[PDB]
Design a protein around this ligand. Structure first.
Ligand SMILES: O=C(O)CC(CC(=O)O)C(=O)O
Ligand SMILES: O=C(O)CC(CC(=O)O)C(=O)O
Lengths: 385, 341
């Protein structure tokens, strides 16, 4: 029984999520390429697989917002500063999912890169804003993070509030470039998902941020004001969502056989939308109807998400900008350059201007602000591989 | 964009009355060197599944349970074992690889593959004679011993040993399924339940009397398949699927197993021999009752003899091993291809 190994790492909050962040060069040699050695290390760091579903024996917190890893490296892509690989660590299975971006940890990626020698020092001012050009390596997309700098170091602290983040910190503006996959895989703004013997559901299926299925709250008997406790103990509801998600995955061409959905839980995401309505958020704060353009709730690994996934926020903004999508309609229809949506923890504004070219809509970028901070830095430990 | 197909070193083999694609663990793409979606996805594509056409024309499968099969072998780090054996039964119609059981037929080829591919210490291989290969069956956590003939330091594949259901004769490979009873033999605690004998030996198997399901025990595939569980009957003469007459005198009982299997599953043959040795099971009764250390049974493709001696002490029966002979040969060796994962 050899001593545990030590691996340099930084535990950070990015937006409304937490994860363990590594520089590629700090990983054990065998883990410096994708594969089982890398996955085994990350699983052990986080505390997975865990039959108890508590992650008491790792850095995870036993939720999709806390069972998370990030590997950053100098980029070899033209006009980029840092390569960003995100691994969503399964709680119950010996599996790390590399198929998506985390749009919340994106907020921390810029800061980690600056703080850890991954960005050309010529690009970092003594004071001001360091524009970090991120190559999102899971999905092959450019993300720009504007990270504030004070005295040659990341300015972490500040007074910017993000609903779902307990305490304010410095604002970090994020720009998801050319978000459309690599927009509407079915070729339609709205489809009907026919789930034989369970119902038929109007849906907008969109590939922007992450592949996402939006359905109307009303078609599920919901209002869009639901909090976690309204849904997460309702196994019938959970099973219904999953069958609809599976059928949408099939319709989007993401899977060829319906049974593939059981082992592909990360994408596509499923969410439901509704017109503005007042509600008390999870924090006790009242979100008034007038505060939002629409309501959106989303599922994450089969349970109602506590706030909204960052990738889903990109999908909401992008869909809202396309007249006729269910997201656009929930927001009242017509052209829209931005929307504020209500999720369980409060509200978020996303900007996404669509422009016609050759009679078709295109979206240059989806923009939103988050914040980030270091929680713990040093070395994580695991038993010797 | 469309990247080239990847190449994965593999051997396509007949083991007993089945065919499968065999891999050394280390030859798999890294992603597939641990259990999980990447492994299952790769195996499905190698075999040609899932296939809505049910023909497997786009992979190595043959569109039957006896031909939609994969095997992953590696040198064992377990005390007293040479080779670790993982068997994957690949669904024809669904995106599923079933890891819940052993293949008793491909078991025969595992020993040969292990010798031929450096998975057994060379010190344990005679130059001429018989190499005893200790197999850890990793799906079910059981030891299986294979006695593989060796000539000039290589596996002796060819020979004159005949297996009903195998077209051409080949070298005899003697197989020993050690302590086949699950860690129990009769999960219900009874030899016969309400009527079925349910036994966990080789593979969990439900045995029912042919007469009670509306059959005789002489059925061939075409009697059922256009219309584990197995049905049993006393000896009766029939034409096998090859046209050869199996005379009633040639067998102790008839066994058909489920699609109706073309011959008999190797694991089911273990269940049959084991159950036959326990006085009072439906299998034992079909063979005329009393103590039995071996039975020959009639299946659609001919007959098979299995040995299993049971010993009684303090009202309980135990079986040290079930034994049978099979054969195996390499059909094709090289690289299989699938699109880049
Ligand atoms: O992607 C998810 O399902 C979960 C996420 C991503 C996000 O919130 O941005 C999480 O909870 O961290
Ligand atoms: O290979 C098959 O035909 C199917 C089997 C195993 C065997 O024949 O040994 C099965 O149904 O398990």
């Amino acid at each position: 029984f050899p001593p545990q190994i030590k691996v340099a790492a930084t535990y950070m909050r990015g937006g409304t999520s937490k994860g363990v962040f590594f520089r590629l060069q700090d990983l054990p040699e065998a883990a410096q390429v994708p594969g089982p050695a890398r996955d085994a290390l990350l699983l052990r760091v986080i505390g997975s697989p865990d039959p108890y579903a508590k992650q008491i024996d790792g850095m995870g917190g036993a939720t999709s917002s806390t069972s998370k890893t990030v590997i950053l490296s100098h980029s070899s892509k033209a006009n980029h500063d840092v390569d960003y690989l995100f691994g969503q660590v399964s709680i119950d299975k010996p599996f790390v999912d590399w198929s998506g971006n985390c749009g919340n940890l994106t907020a921390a990626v810029g800061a980690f890169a600056i703080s850890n020698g991954l960005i050309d020092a010529a690009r970092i001012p003594r004071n001001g804003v360091c524009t970090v050009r991120i190559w999102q390596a899971n999905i092959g997309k450019t993300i720009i993070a504007h990270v504030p700098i004070t005295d040659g170091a990341v300015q972490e602290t500040g007074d910017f509030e993000l609903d779902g983040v307990t305490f304010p910190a410095a604002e970090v503006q994020i720009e998801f470039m050319n978000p459309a996959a690599d927009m509407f895989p079915t070729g339609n703004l709205v489809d009907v998902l026919e789930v034989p013997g369970i119902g038929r559901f109007n849906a907008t299926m969109i590939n922007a941020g992450i592949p996402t299925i939006f359905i109307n709250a009303e078609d599920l008997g919901y209002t869009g004001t639901e909090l976690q406790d309204d849904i997460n103990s309702d196994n019938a509801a959970l099973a219904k969502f999953e069958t609809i998600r599976a059928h949408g995955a099939l319709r989007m061409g993401l899977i060829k056989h319906i049974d593939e959905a059981a082992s592909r839980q990360h994408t596509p995401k499923i969410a439901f939308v509704a017109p503005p309505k007042s509600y008390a958020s999870s924090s006790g704060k009242t979100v008034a109807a007038e505060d939002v353009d629409l309501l959106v709730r989303a599922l994450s690994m089969g349970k109602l998400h506590h706030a909204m996934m960052g990738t889903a926020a990109v999908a909401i903004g992008t869909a809202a900008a396309i007249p006729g999508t269910l997201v656009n309609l929930a927001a009242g229809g017509g052209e829209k350059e931005a929307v504020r949506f209500g999720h369980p923890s409060g509200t978020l504004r996303v900007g996404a201007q669509a422009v016609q070219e050759n009679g078709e809509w295109t979206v240059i970028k989806a923009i939103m602000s988050r914040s980030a901070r270091v929680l713990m830095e040093g070395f994580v430990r695991v038993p010797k591989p």
